[PDB]
């Protein structure tokens, strides 16, 4: 039992912090490990937290704070405030570590990627249409995407005009007792 | 992106943040296959050594969940955030 560094004297038996291990950047070497730590965390803590809990030796630590956009308390209403910032730490591991590559879009069926992508597009088009209204504009009728209801009325039009089907008065417009 | 990959030690300390070594996150269908939280009545029969070791099993379990949440969003893996909240 001999740590590579000098250990402190204040013992923490029940730490409540949550450490997140984030994927590195594309061009970063394989000896850098980035983590999300509490704002009160310091370099000395991560070095001691990564060795006593995970048995990971680090030769150096880097830390930087990421701010958060100022916001209103309730969406677009309320006073103007600023959330608590985020602290990220990069450890220079003594042993390299390489992450796995994300699965292919077609191999994400365990996460229900098919349904998730459909929902994402819907929300992607909702925030894009709301941005067109925030500029003081609207989508002209000619650019609206034709829905399934408009694709069905164009096939009926070709069937009536051609002569395949014969038009007849509606029978479900209203349920009258007269039936005339 | 076409370099020979390095050999990462099998027993690396940072492998404890991952649920599956191929996909950091766990499948939502297998992420909910868990029990319930310990009741205070059941913990009164555990010594300090059992409650001190169990606390750190929960800490490392939350660090493992926070790691799967951050990856799922960035990698656009899919759903699973609603199941990690109940497990957490």
């Amino acid at each position: 039992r001999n740590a590579p560094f000098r250990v402190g004297k204040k013992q923490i038996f029940l730490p409540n912090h949550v450490i997140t291990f984030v994927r590195p950047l594309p061009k970063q070497p394989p000896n850098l490990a980035t983590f999300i730590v509490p704002l009160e965390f310091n370099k000395l803590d991560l070095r001691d937290y990564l060795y006593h809990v995970y048995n990971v030796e680090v030769t150096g630590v880097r830390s930087f704070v990421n701010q958060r956009m100022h916001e209103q308390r309730h969406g677009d209403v309320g006073n103007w405030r600023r959330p608590k910032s985020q602290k990220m730490m990069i450890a220079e591991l003594a042993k390299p570590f390489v992450w796995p590559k994300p699965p292919a879009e077609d191999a994400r069926e365990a996460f229900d990627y098919a349904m998730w992508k459909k929902q994402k597009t819907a929300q992607e088009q909702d925030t894009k249409f709301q941005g067109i209204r925030a500029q003081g504009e609207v989508v002209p009728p000619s650019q609206f995407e034709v829905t399934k209801d408009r694709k069905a009325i164009k096939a009926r039009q070709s069937k009536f005009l051609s002569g395949e089907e014969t038009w007849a008065p509606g029978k479900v417009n209203a349920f009258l007792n007269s039936k005339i | 992106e076409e370099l020979p990959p390095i050999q990462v030690d099998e027993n690396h300390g940072l492998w404890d943040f991952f649920y599956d070594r191929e996909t950091v996150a766990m499948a939502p269908l297998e992420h909910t296959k868990h029990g319930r939280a310990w009741t205070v009545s059941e913990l009164r029969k555990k010594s300090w050594d059992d409650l001190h070791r169990l606390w750190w099993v929960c800490v490392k379990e939350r660090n493992r969940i926070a790691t799967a949440n951050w990856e799922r969003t960035k990698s656009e893996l899919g759903f699973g955030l609603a199941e990690a909240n109940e497990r957490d």
Partner: peptide, 29 residues
């Protein structure tokens, strides 16, 4: 089924709404 209450649920409930629509199509044939 709203557009924002569809991703806040589990896959167990999201798949329970597909069985509803699946069995709803077998009755139309």
């Amino acid at each position: 089924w709203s557009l924002f209450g569809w991703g806040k649920q589990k896959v167990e409930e999201r798949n329970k709404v597909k069985e509803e629509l699946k069995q709803s199509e077998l009755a139309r044939t």
